[PDB]
RNA sequence: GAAUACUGCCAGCUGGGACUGAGGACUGCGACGUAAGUCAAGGAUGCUGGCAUAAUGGUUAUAUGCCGCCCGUCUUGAAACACGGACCAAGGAGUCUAACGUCUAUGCGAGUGUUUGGGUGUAAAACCCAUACGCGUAAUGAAAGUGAACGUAGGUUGGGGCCUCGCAAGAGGUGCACAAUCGACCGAUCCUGAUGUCUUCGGAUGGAUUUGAGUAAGAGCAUAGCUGUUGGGACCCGAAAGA
RNA sequence: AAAUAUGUAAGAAGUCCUUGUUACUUAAUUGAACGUGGACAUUUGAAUGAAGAGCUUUUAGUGGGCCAUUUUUGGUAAGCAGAACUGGCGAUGCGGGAUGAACCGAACGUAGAGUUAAGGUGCCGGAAUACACGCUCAUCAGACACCACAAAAGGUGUUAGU
RNA sequence: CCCUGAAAAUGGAUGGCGCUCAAGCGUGUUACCUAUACUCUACCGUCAGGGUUGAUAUGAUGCCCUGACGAGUAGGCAGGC
RNA sequence: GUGGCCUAUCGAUCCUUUAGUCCCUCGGAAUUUGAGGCUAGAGGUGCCAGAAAAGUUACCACAGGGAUAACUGGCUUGUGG
């Protein structure tokens, strides 16, 4: 996955998300893929339903198989849609967003600044 | 019909994570931690400190 | 025919409303409204008045009395909204408010008849006025210049920004 | 704006209804619409899907194709559903007593089936009968036996039967089809 | 490799079961303690430009 | 019916379906067969390969009737039989008073032998037949019995 | 020995502003409660005022702010210093037919098609019908000709559905259509050449890196429809010519 | 002898054990191919994704192209002519580059609210005549990519430096 | 950085006005402005997956639940006037 | 070892001709000439997937083309200055 980061570096930022931010982007956007639907989370029976199998009972079993990559992380990061974030509330923090984050733009591993940004975004 | 924010709305917040009621009891949020008097070694501070 | 049929017809029973979850909680006023506080009326027939604040009102309205003696307001309701709260406080500790509520400012009974179409106050009214507002000149007379700003009335001036000013 | 992946608003492809504008079949595919929804035998979902089915997607099937299905072990007392036409065939000179359920008989498959001690029925019988399809056995008539297959996937070294209206020799047998006139396919 | 994991499998059936057969990508580093004993940090700095001719 | 016409939908719309650049003209290739050795070559030789060319004898004057000679096969045989009578040959196979099929007031001219008749004799008139026909028939218990 | 900055965390508290109020009996998840119950918990209610009509709103004209090049066409590219268009009304261009392909609907189904004709009639209608004929039910070969079961109409792999066991996965059995594959059968080609004999006929039996638009428990016929094809004036208008 | 690009594999149509068929093959009961029986879930043999997968029939338009980065041929060169890969325009509006097919940003149902992209914030013109460190005075200053040009060569002009 | 090198024809173009410790050039830090883009909500349509028949509904290509999508010439198909 | 060490060295339909099979047909029988078939080569199309083909027009015609020349303009500036 590291080779695949390389190769769209210039079109994401990614970087190490901390469990504040996991929990929020969870709590505030976390949605599942139920039946090829879109799903609101907002319960822990629906968590159960479809992800109760690998012993994920609640969102914060969720939240803890993405925070510490389980042996399930791969399931359960699949059940998760992809998350919808905004625009950032603050802006980019940059004139010019598309240069590296080293170089002064926004784009490629910017790896602990990822939490402000996504906070941000949320 | 609505999807309704935790981290606002203490009652979905809480309906959610039931142990959330715990840590804002316990205030895990501002847990005091232990005192360790704990000295880096001189090589360390050289090392930092050098040209 | 000129027009066929509508082959379905709606149904013609009105629905009942779904059970609401919204509870009334009483209002939570400002910390510097408190009874005894001069107020500026900013709209109304008496914009720019000095005023005192008496009683919070169960329909939300604040109790005002900025007597006949000083400024020739009577008792009646204001909006919390309308009103700026001053710094300036007089004792309201010997006047008696309980008797004023809602009934006792209710106007009228309005048909679709009784109106005025081309073009006295209550004997009550006038004794009670007479007899809350007889208090508060006794502590308006208590301290200097007092009944002159109450009897004055309230305005901007020229290079006069309100959202530095204090009250 | 969005990277789609697929084409977007695609429809699925298959029938959803009889084209046809029977109001038997209609009634038909209600029936089974319900029993389909209602019970979880996938006997249900396969007739529904087959009363949709087009005159060349339900060719006829045969009562010698009946009794060789019969023939099979353990399934000499089943109940044979064709969902479509039973016709009539004279090679075959011997029937067992049976029960066949059909949309349509031929007056000489009925009067073989019926000859023979069995009994047809309609696919409401059958739904009254088995409701989920019990005891039953599905025949499909053969499909690529339609003449119009034989010219599919035309071309050279293929082996496919040309589209042509007259036959016989001076009709698309010379130069292209033998070495000695040109080249062969 | 198709026969190492037939032995793998073979010898978790008798002692440790779920012997992981499947292949994994390079997993990254854990925590280790680096030692300046014999190895004390030396400073490097960027070199002036020289023209060699 | 015109009103179920895609005429009908291209009402307003400039080409009527022709396309701007290629413009619907007269015969931009050619009427009928032209050119199929020359510009139609590849569909000529795709879809219709033998179409040049002669192969074979010439026949003047042919008579399709000196050719007439329907054939029937034996697991048809039996349906020449009516109906009312069949079941009851079918049950006493007898050498002696077996049923006669006469296949070319049927209007056939030759049996051949698709074969699994059952095993009741016949005597089967025809003016032509094949080996494994007579072959079943006889190893039936019937006979064949020609006729001009 | 402390503070403070910076960075980070809180399932910390709290004030101001804006937009939104979709749904319409109940059902759910919860919270607070000793319980009864209540609640910010599967989408707004409560209280109050004015007006009750041109007041809001619609239409229309104008003004103001910002924006807005003339359509159609050919074209890589049109507002073009490319062409047609002064204006308006009425007319004005993918049709019908013969023969067909695919698909679809319908009737009947190893058959199918009444309408050439006859009978009949309330008379170009409707109704009824014999013998033929067309296509299909057999292919193959230039042709003379010959002409489709070793077998449960074969074996193998998969296969929906069904059957049996089974708390439930699942495991067995049967497996139509369909797909791949190895065979068997029919005709052509090449070869082998028995009994027999008008001694040159006949061609049993067996075979093959050959070949067919075949068989292997039929699927067709007829009518109608959209689309597509060919001939026709053939979407409409248009030569210089020829007789 | 690279980089980029490119073929294959990562298993159930598999692996192992035993012994069945043949007219092929072997000196041979040796193999070859195809098999009968028997043993193989935490992972059935790397990751990520999978929007349903597989299959068929039939038919429209098109068969003048052009532009940008990079590679590249002829030519002094060309808004020239000719190739390669990709992305575009053609077929496409929208915000920005004053203006413009192709550049930047972003692709479009009808609306409301919030946040932004590229580009900007003296006035035209929405938005700091913001903050900070310097440089420059031109009797042809300069002022944003594509892009609407400038060179060799010079100056005790002035500023840093070896 | 500035100046010389540096010449073309109607009057004219950092877009214009103008700007000189800039409103120029290099660089840094923030705040702010606004797209049919992103987030949330409503409504329209389309596609997909579903629910709904033992006295319960205009009696079902109806009603309803859930999710996601929406640029378009030549062209194809569908529903309508 | 199924021509040339490998990578080039070549040719449809119709027609004629030859070889093969001694085979099929000439349709009212039959024999012998003659003719026609089936399998395999050759005779040739070099515009090489393959018409049988001389000019001229300053007397000219038509359908069109800015898919394309003969001015200006535009890019370029070898050459000229
Ligand atoms: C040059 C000579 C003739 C030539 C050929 O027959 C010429 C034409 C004649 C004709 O009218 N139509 C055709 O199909 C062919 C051929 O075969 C060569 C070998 C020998």
Redesign the interface.
Same mark, same amino acid.
């Given at each position: 996955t590291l080779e695949l980061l390389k190769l769209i570096e210039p079109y994401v930022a990614y970087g190490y998300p901390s469990y504040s931010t996991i929990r929020q982007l969870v709590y505030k956007r976390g949605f599942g893929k139920i039946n090829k639907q879109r799903v609101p989370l907002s319960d822990n029976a629906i968590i159960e339903a479809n992800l109760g199998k690998y012993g994920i009972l609640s969102i914060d079993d969720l939240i803890h198989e993405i925070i510490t990559v389980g042996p399930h992380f791969k399931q359960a990061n699949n059940f998760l849609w992809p998350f919808k974030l905004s625009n950032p509330s603050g802006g980019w923090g940059v004139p010019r967003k598309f240069k590296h984050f080293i170089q002064g733009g926004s784009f490629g591993n910017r790896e602990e600044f990822i939490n402000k940004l996504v906070k941000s975004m949320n | 019909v609505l $999807? $309704? #924010?935790? +981290?606002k709305n203490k009652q979905? +917040?809480l309906? +959610? #994570?039931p142990?959330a009621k715990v840590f804002a009891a316990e205030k895990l949020g501002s847990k005091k931690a232990e005192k360790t008097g704990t000295k880096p070694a001189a090589?360390?501070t050289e090392?930092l400190k050098?040209? | 025919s000129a027009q066929k049929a509508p082959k379905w017809y709606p149904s013609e029973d009105v629905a009942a409303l779904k059970k609401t979850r919204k509870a009334a909680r009483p209002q939570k006023l400002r910390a510097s409204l408190v009874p005894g506080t001069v107020l500026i009326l900013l709209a109304g027939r008496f914009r720019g008045k000095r005023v005192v604040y008496l009683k919070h009102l169960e329909d939300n309205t604040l109790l005002i009395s900025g007597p006949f003696k000083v400024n020739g307001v009577p008792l009646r309701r204001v909006n919390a909204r309308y009103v700026i709260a001053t710094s300036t406080k007089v004792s309201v500790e010997g006047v008696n408010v309980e008797k004023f509520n809602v009934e006792y400012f209710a106007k009228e009974k309005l048909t679709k008849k009784e109106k005025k179409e081309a073009k006295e106050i209550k004997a009550e009214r006038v004794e009670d006025q007479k007899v809350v507002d007889k208090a508060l000149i006794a502590e308006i007379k208590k301290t200097p210049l007092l009944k002159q700003y109450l009897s004055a009335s309230f305005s901007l001036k020229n290079g006069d920004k309100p959202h530095m000013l204090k009250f | 704006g969005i990277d789609h992946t697929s084409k977007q608003h695609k429809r699925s492809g298959h029938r959803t209804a009889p084209k046809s504008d029977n109001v038997y079949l209609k009634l038909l595919v209600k029936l089974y619409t319900f029993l389909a929804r209602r019970t979880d035998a996938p006997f249900n979902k396969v007739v529904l899907k087959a009363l949709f089915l087009s005159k060349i997607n339900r060719p006829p099937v045969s009562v010698s194709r009946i009794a060789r299905a019969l023939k099979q072990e353990g399934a000499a007392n089943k109940t044979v559903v064709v969902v479509g036409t039973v016709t009539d065939d004279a090679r075959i000179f011997e029937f067992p007593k049976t029960t066949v359920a059909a949309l349509r008989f031929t007056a000489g498959a009925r009067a073989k089936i019926v000859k023979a001690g069995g009994e047809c029925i309609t696919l409401d019988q059958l739904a009254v009968r088995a409701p989920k399809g019990q005891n039953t056995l599905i025949l499909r008539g053969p499909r690529n036996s339609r003449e119009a297959v034989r010219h599919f996937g035309m071309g050279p070294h293929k082996g496919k039967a040309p589209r042509i209206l007259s036959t016989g020799r001076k009709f698309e047998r010379a130069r292209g089809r033998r070495r000695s006139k040109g080249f062969k396919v | 490799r198709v026969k190492a994991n037939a032995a793998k499998r073979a010898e978790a059936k008798a002692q440790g079961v779920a012997v992981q057969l499947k292949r994994q990508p390079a997993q990254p580093r854990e925590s280790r303690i680096v030692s300046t004993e014999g190895n004390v940090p030396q400073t490097l700095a960027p070199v002036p430009y020289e023209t060699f001719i | 019916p015109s009103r179920f016409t895609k005429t009908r939908k291209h009402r307003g719309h400039v080409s009527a379906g022709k396309g701007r650049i290629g413009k619907h003209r007269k015969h931009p290739g050619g009427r009928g067969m032209a050119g199929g050795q020359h510009h139609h070559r590849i569909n000529m030789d795709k879809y219709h390969p033998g179409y040049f060319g002669k192969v074979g004898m010439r026949y003047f004057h042919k008579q399709q009737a000196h050719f007439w000679k329907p054939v029937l096969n034996l697991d048809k045989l039996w349906t020449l039989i009516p109906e009312d009578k069949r079941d009851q040959y079918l049950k006493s196979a007898s050498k002696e008073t077996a049923p006669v099929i006469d296949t070319l007031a049927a209007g056939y001219g030759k049996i051949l032998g698709k074969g699994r008749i059952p095993n009741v004799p016949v005597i089967v008139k025809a003016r032509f037949v094949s080996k494994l026909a007579e072959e079943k028939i006889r190893a039936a218990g019937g006979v064949v019995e020609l006729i001009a």
């Open positions: - | $999807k $309704k #924010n935790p +981290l979905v +917040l309906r +959610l #994570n142990y090589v360390f090392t050098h040209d | - | - | - | -």
